[PDB]
Design a protein around this ligand. Structure first.
Ligand code: J1E
Length: 138
């Protein structure tokens, strides 16, 4: 039963074969969730499920550099459900982040920030009850 927003340090940055697992429950009437992999003030990977963008559900992914957002990558497959428990897994691969939700592959995000060892914090925010956030090496 962790506090949101939650900041999870990633000691020494991310590395290929690192697996991050987030367990929680989506609040009723949730509007948004966000995972922010941070390199200092920059956001290397922003993963942003939106439950009502013009009455559509969409996942927006982006990178923020020098306080400016880049080109969005959008995914219309939406596995989250208001009120229900979820599992997000982020596997770091050499050329992308690989995201699975409830054990089903969802998307890959090509690395725009290439100093992977400097991506050393994960922020978790939005309309969820957070149960656990951890990492391991596979
Ligand atoms: O990009 C990423 C950014 O977006 C902006 S909103 C502006 C664009 O969404 C508009 N737009 C559409 C398009 C486009 C591109 C292709 C197709 C198409 F149809 C449209 N191009 N630009 C949003 O404020 C940003 N944010 C979210 C949060 C946040 C904080 C706490 C909790 C939480 F859950 C989230 N903090 N900052 C972050 O999410």
């Amino acid at each position: 039963p962790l506090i949101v927003p939650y900041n999870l340090p990633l000691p020494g940055g991310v590395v290929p074969r690192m697996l991050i697992t987030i367990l929680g429950t989506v609040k009723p009437n949730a509007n948004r969730i966000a995972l922010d992999f941070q390199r200092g003030n920059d956001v290397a990977f922003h993963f942003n499920p939106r439950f009502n963008e013009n009455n559509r559900r969409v996942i927006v992914c982006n990178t923020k550099l020098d306080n400016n957002w880049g080109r969005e990558e959008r995914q219309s497959v939406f596995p989250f459900e208001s009120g229900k428990p979820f599992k997000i897994q982020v596997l770091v691969e050499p050329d992308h982040f690989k995201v699975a939700v409830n054990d089903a592959h969802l998307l890959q995000y090509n690395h725009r920030v290439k100093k992977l060892n400097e991506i050393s914090k994960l922020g978790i925010s939005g309309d969820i009850d957070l149960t656990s956030a951890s990492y391991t090496m596979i």
